[PDB]
Design a protein around this ligand. Structure first.
Ligand SMILES: Cc1cn([C@H]2C[C@H](O)[C@@H](COP(=O)(O)OP(=O)(O)O)O2)c(=O)[nH]c1=O
Ligand SMILES: Cc1cn([C@H]2C[C@H](O)[C@@H](COP(=O)(O)OP(=O)(O)O)O2)c(=O)[nH]c1=O
Ligand SMILES: Cc1cn([C@H]2C[C@H](O)[C@@H](COP(=O)(O)OP(=O)(O)O)O2)c(=O)[nH]c1=O
Ligand SMILES: Cc1cn([C@H]2C[C@H](O)[C@@H](COP(=O)(O)OP(=O)(O)O)O2)c(=O)[nH]c1=O
Ligand SMILES: Cc1cn([C@H]2C[C@H](O)[C@@H](COP(=O)(O)OP(=O)(O)O)O2)c(=O)[nH]c1=O
Ligand SMILES: Cc1cn([C@H]2C[C@H](O)[C@@H](COP(=O)(O)OP(=O)(O)O)O2)c(=O)[nH]c1=O
Ligand SMILES: Cc1cn([C@H]2C[C@H](O)[C@@H](COP(=O)(O)OP(=O)(O)O)O2)c(=O)[nH]c1=O
Ligand SMILES: Cc1cn([C@H]2C[C@H](O)[C@@H](COP(=O)(O)OP(=O)(O)O)O2)c(=O)[nH]c1=O
Ligand SMILES: [Cl-]
Ligand SMILES: [Cl-]
Ligand SMILES: [Cl-]
Ligand SMILES: [Cl-]
Ligand SMILES: [Cl-]
Lengths: 292, 295, 291, 292
C-alpha cells in the first residue's frame, strides 16, 4: 500500500567544497540541499522515505533527519558502497520498496514554481507504468531530452542530442509502479559499468507505459552542480523567502499543513530553536501567520 | 468601444530611491537586463491588450517615447500623456479619459513586476470581465505592510484595508487593475484622500459598494518583486537573472510576446535581431526567429 | 588647482541603455557616475567638468547641478559623438585653461583599502603624467602596462597575446597642463579616434610617465555587462552592510574634506528624511560615534 | 618559529538547520570550505605548524579535508574539544602542541580580505613579546567587542557591546601571542557562562601594558559567516573579487607555492588531478606562470 519514496544522496566538479561535505548537505541559502527534494516527496504525499548515501555520509544524513517522526514521516537509510548508477537505487532499496509503488528523486534536485503540488499529486496517483518529468528550457542540448505526443505519452529520450526533438529535459524525479524493481534487476549495465535510470525508463517506454508531466514556463530547476549555480540558487531562495515570506522546503510546515503533526508538535520544535530564525518561523506557523 | 485598452502609469515617485531616481525615472531603472517598464508592459500584452497609453511626467515622457516609440515594433499602439502634477493613481483615468473613450481598460503601475507559472491564464480571465472591476491579491506570510484584500471563495471582495494591524487575509493588493467603462466617471467622483491624492483604493471601494468588485489570487510560487528599495531592486535583478539563466527564456521580452501573439512577423524579429547582432538581447531575438529548436 | 574631467558619453547593454545613459545606471544605491566622481573628490579635486551626449547631458545636470551641494563646482560640455577618449581634452580645452587635470571614465568603479593615499600622490604630480596599473590574473583583454621598480612606465600594449606584465590600464589618468597640446597633436586612428593611448605614449617617450599600482585586494568592477552590473551592485551592498560606510557618498567626502558644513549635511538629511540615504547623512552629522 | 591554531569546533544553533549535520567551518564560502579562509591568514603570516581543533564528531571530516598538511608544505595536527568551553581553552587543549613557541590563534569562521593585509599579518607575526590583536573599522561598533587604542597601537580598553563605544574599531577572531599565553590561560577564571574567555586573556596582557592592536581600515572586509544572509553575501563577495581581479582568495596551494613551501610540480600534479574542475584550472594557470 501507500507509495514510497527514495532520495538518492550519495555520489567532483565542486572540489574542494565536497571533499569533506556531502554535496546534498551543502546549504541552499538556509537549509541543507536535501530538504528540497525531500519537500517534493512530502508535497506528493509520501510519508515512508528511504535515504541512500555513502558510508561516510549516511550517518550525517541520520544526524540531520533522524527517524522522521518530527515530520510525521518515517525515514530509513541504506548505503550505496559505490555510485553504481541511478537505477542502483532500486537494487539497494529492493527490500524497502517491498510490493509498493515508489517515487525516486535525486538529492541534488531543487525545484520551485506556482502550481507544482497538483502536478506532483497527479504523478503520485499513477495506477501503473511510470511517470517522468519534462522541464521546459530554451536550449535542451546539455540534457537528457524527452519527446512526447500531445497526450503525454513518451516516444523517445535522447542524451544530449545536437538536434533535440523537444525543448523538455529530464530532471531527477521519477514515479514508478512496483515493476521497476525487477526491471532494474534485469537491465544491462552501460559499457562503463553502471545501472542507468535511462535504461529503466526506456523499458517502460518500449512497453508504451511511460507518461510525462511537464514543468513549464515559470517553473525553476536550479543548478546545484557548480559554484556559480549554488550561489545563484541560494540568492533565489533568499529573494522568494523575503518577498513572499514563506519558506521553501520547511519540512515541518509541509507536515503540519498535511495534518501529519500537531500544532503542539510545532510549538515544541519552535521552543527548542527559540533564538534562531528557523525557530521563529516555526513559532509563527503554530500561531497561524494570521490566516495561514 | 471594441477592445479593452491598457494604461501604464509611469510618473512621479517619492525620494525613497534617492539618489538613483534623481535623474532617472524609476520605471526606466534596469531590472537585470531590461528597463523596469518592460515588465508591466509584458503583462498588458500577455492579457492581449494592444492599445496602450503611457503616462509619465513632463520631464520623463520624452525618454519613455525614446524607448518605446509608437509601438509598431511590438505590433501595438503606444500613446503618451503627461501627468503634470502627481495627483494619485486614480488620476490616470482623468488624464486618460479621451484615450479610454467607451472602452474597458486595464491599468498597471509602471513599477510592478510579476512572474509565475500559469500567470497568463489569470490575466486572460481578468481581461475577459463583463462588468465591474477585477483586482489582484498576492499571497504573503505577513501582509501588514500593504493594502490587504478580503474576499469570499468565489473571489467577491469584502474589504480593502491599508496596513492593518489585524489583517483580514494574507493577500495584498498590487498595482494591476481591470475595469469596465464606468471607471472614468467613478474616478471623476471620488474625494481626495487625507494625503491629497485621488486614490485607486477609492475607485475600488466604489466598485466594492456597488457589489461589483472581484479579485484574482496570485498564490504560492508567484513572484511580485520589490522595486521600491535598493535591496529589493538588487534582489529583483538576481531573480530575473536566475530564471533566465536556468530556464533560458527571457522574462518580459516584448518582441517575443508580440511575435508569439501573431502581432509582428518573423521578418520583423529578424530585423530587430540584425540591428542588435553583437548583443545578448540581439542573439535571443535571432534564436527566437530560428525557433529555439522547438521553443 | 588641478581640475578634473569625467567622460560620461557613449550598446552591449541594450535595452537598459536605450533611454538611460550607461553612467546613470545604478550601482546598488547610487548612480554609476558617483563612483568615479568620488575618486576625483578623494584626490582633492573641486573643479569638475562632466562630458556626455546631447541626449544624456541634461540628465547629468539634473543629478549634479552646479556642485555647490558638495562644495565643488560642476561644468558641462557636450560631445556630439564618441570621437575617442583623448577628445575630452579637445572638448575640454577652455575648461582646462593652464591647469593640470585628472581624467576619469564615467563607467569606472574602483574600491580598495589605501586607495586615497595613491590618489593624493598621483594628484600631487609636479610634471609629466600618472596613470594606473590594475593587477589581474589574465591581462589579455586590456591595455597592458610595464614599469620598472621606480614606478617609471616603460611600455603599454593593447591586448597583447603575450603580455609583458599582469597590470592593466584602467580609465583614470592624471596630467600636467601639457596634455591639451599633446591631445591636439596626436594622430587620429584608422577610425578617426583620438586615443588616450596615443597621449600616454607621448609622456612615455619622454620618460615622464609614472604609474600608481592598484594591487591585489583592490577591485575594478565590471559595469559593462548585465551580470557585471548585478555583481557590482551586490558587492557594494555587502561592503556597505559589513563595514557600514557608504562607498562614494559624495556629501560625506565633501563634509570630511571640510568643503561643506555640518549644517549643510543636516539640511540635506532633512530633505531626505524617511530615506536610507537621508539617515546616513543624519548619522554623519551626528558623528557616527568616533567617526 | 611561531605556531598556529585554528579553533573550528562547536557553534550554536543560529544557522540551524545547515549546521545540524555539517560543521559550521566546513560550510562553503563560494568555492572553498570556510576554514580555508582563516587557514590562509596563518599561511600568509608565514606559519607552517598548525593545530586544528574541533569536536570529536567533526575532527575526522577536517582531517578528510586537510590531511597531514604536506600537500601545502605545512604540518597539520588535530586535537579534540568535546564542547565549546571558551576560546581561551584553545591554549589548554593545545598546550603540548604550543610548547615554548609563540602562537597565533584564529577562529575557523573568520574571513578577512583586503589590500595590504599581508604586511599587517607579517608585522603581528613578528612580535617580540606581549600580544597583538586586531581592530576592524565599522560605522557602528555597538554589536561587537570594541577596542580603544593609542597612536602607537597600545590597547587601552576592550568593551563588549558598549552603548557608548570608545572607538569605531571592533575585535575579530585573530590573535598573536608570545609564549606567556599558556600560563595566562591557565590562570584566568571561568566566566559567568562557564567559559574560558579569550577576552580574559587579552585583558591580562592589556593590564600589564603588553597588548597592541593592528588596524584593518576602510576598504578591508571582515565577512559575516554567522547568519544565512551573511554567508550568501560573503559568497557573492568572494565570487566578485575572484572574477574581477582573477586571483583566488584563500587558495592554500597558491600561498604555499609562492611562499616556496611546495614546488611548481607539486602544484601541477594537484592541478592535473583536478583538471576537469575550475579550481584545478586555476592551479594550472598559476604554475604555468599566469604570464607573470
Ligand atoms: C550515479 C549516482 C548518483 N547519485 C546521486 C548524486 C546526485 O545527488 C544525483 C545525480 O548525480 P549524477 O548523475 O552523478 O550527476 P549530478 O551530480 O549533475 O546530478 O544522484 C548517487 O547517490 N549515487 C549514484 O550512483
Ligand atoms: C505549500 C508549500 C509549497 N512549497 C513550494 C512547492 C512549489 O515549488 C511552490 C508553490 O506551492 P504549491 O504547493 O504548488 O502551491 P499552489 O498550488 O498554490 O501554487 O512552493 C514549499 O516549499 N512549501 C510548502 O509548504
Ligand atoms: C501616485 C502616483 C503614482 N504613479 C506611479 C509611480 C509608480 O510606477 C506607481 C506606484 O507609486 P506609489 O503609489 O508612489 O507607490 P510605490 O512606489 O510603492 O509603487 O504609480 C504615477 O505615475 N503617478 C501618481 O500620481
Ligand atoms: C509566454 C511568456 C510568458 N512570460 C511570463 C509570464 C509568466 O510570469 C511566466 C509564465 O508564462 P505563462 O504565459 O503564464 O505560461 P504558462 O501557462 O505555460 O506557465 O512567464 C514572459 O515573460 N514572456 C513570454 O513570452
Ligand atoms: C570612446 C568614448 C568613450 N566615452 C566614455 C564612455 C565610458 O564611460 C568610457 C569608456 O568608453 P569605452 O572604452 O568606449 O567603453 P567601455 O568602458 O564601456 O568598455 O568613456 C565617451 O564619453 N566618449 C567617447 O568617445
Ligand atoms: C574616506 C572614503 C573612502 N571611500 C572609498 C575609497 C576606497 O575605495 C575605500 C577605502 O578608503 P581610503 O580613503 O583609501 O581609506 P584608507 O586610506 O584608510 O585605506 O573607500 C569612499 O567611498 N568614501 C569615503 O568617504
Ligand atoms: C567558544 C568557542 C568557539 N569555537 C569556534 C566556533 C567558531 O569558529 C569560532 C567563534 O565562536 P563563537 O565565539 O561562539 O561565536 P561565532 O560563532 O558567532 O563566531 O570559534 C570553538 O571551536 N570552541 C569554543 O569553545
Ligand atoms: C598573495 C595572496 C593574498 N591573498 C589575500 C590576502 C589579502 O586579503 C589580499 C591582498 O593580498 P596581500 O598579500 O595583502 O597583497 P598586497 O600587499 O599586494 O595587497 O588577498 C590571498 O588570499 N592569497 C594570496 O596568495
Ligand atoms: Cl531518463
Ligand atoms: Cl480576521
Ligand atoms: Cl486598492
Ligand atoms: Cl593608455
Ligand atoms: Cl577580546
Amino acid at each position: 500500500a501507500h507509495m514510497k519514496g527514495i532520495v538518492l544522496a550519495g555520489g567532483t566538479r565542486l572540489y574542494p567544497i565536497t571533499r569533506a561535505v556531502s554535496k546534498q548537505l551543502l546549504p541552499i541559502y538556509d537549509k541543507p540541499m536535501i530538504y528540497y527534494p525531500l519537500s517534493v516527496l512530502m508535497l506528493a504525499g509520501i510519508r515512508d522515505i528511504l535515504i541512500i548515501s555513502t558510508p561516510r555520509d549516511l550517518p550525517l544524513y541520520r544526524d540531520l533527519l533522524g527517524d522522521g517522526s518530527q515530520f510525521g514521516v518515517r525515514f530509513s537509510y541504506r548505503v550505496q558502497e559505490e555510485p553504481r548508477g541511478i537505477a542502483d537505487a532500486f537494487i539497494v532499496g529492493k527490500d524497502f520498496i517491498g510490493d509498493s509503488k515508489v517515487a525516486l528523486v535525486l538529492g541534488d534536485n531543487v525545484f520551485y514554481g506556482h502550481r507544482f503540488s497538483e502536478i506532483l499529486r497527479r504523478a503520485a496517483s499513477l495506477e501503473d507504468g511510470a511517470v517522468i518529468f519534462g522541464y521546459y528550457v530554451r536550449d535542451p542540448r546539455p540534457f537528457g531530452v524527452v519527446e512526447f505526443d500531445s497526450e503525454g505519452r513518451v516516444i523517445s529520450i535522447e542524451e544530449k542530442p545536437s538536434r533535440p526533438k523537444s525543448n523538455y529535459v529530464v530532471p531527477g524525479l521519477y514515479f514508478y509502479d512496483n515493476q521497476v524493481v525487477e526491471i532494474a534487476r534485469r537491465i544491462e549495465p552501460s559499457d562503463r559499468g553502471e545501472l542507468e535510470i535511462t535504461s529503466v525508463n526506456e523499458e517502460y517506454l518500449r512497453m508504451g507505459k511511460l507518461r510525462v508531466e511537464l514543468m513549464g514556463r515559470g517553473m525553476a530547476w536550479l543548478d546545484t552542480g557548480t559554484h556559480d549555480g549554488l550561489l545563484e540558487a541560494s540568492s533565489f531562495i533568499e529573494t522568494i523567502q523575503k518577498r513572499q515570506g514563506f519558506y521553501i522546503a520547511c519540512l515541518e510546515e509541509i507536515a503540519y499543513n498535511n495534518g501529519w503533526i500537531t500544532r503542539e508538535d510545532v510549538l515544541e520544535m519552535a521552543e527548542k530553536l527559540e533564538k534562531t530564525d528557523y525557530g521563529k518561523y516555526l513559532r509563527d506557523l503554530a500561531e497561524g501567520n494570521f490566516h495561514g
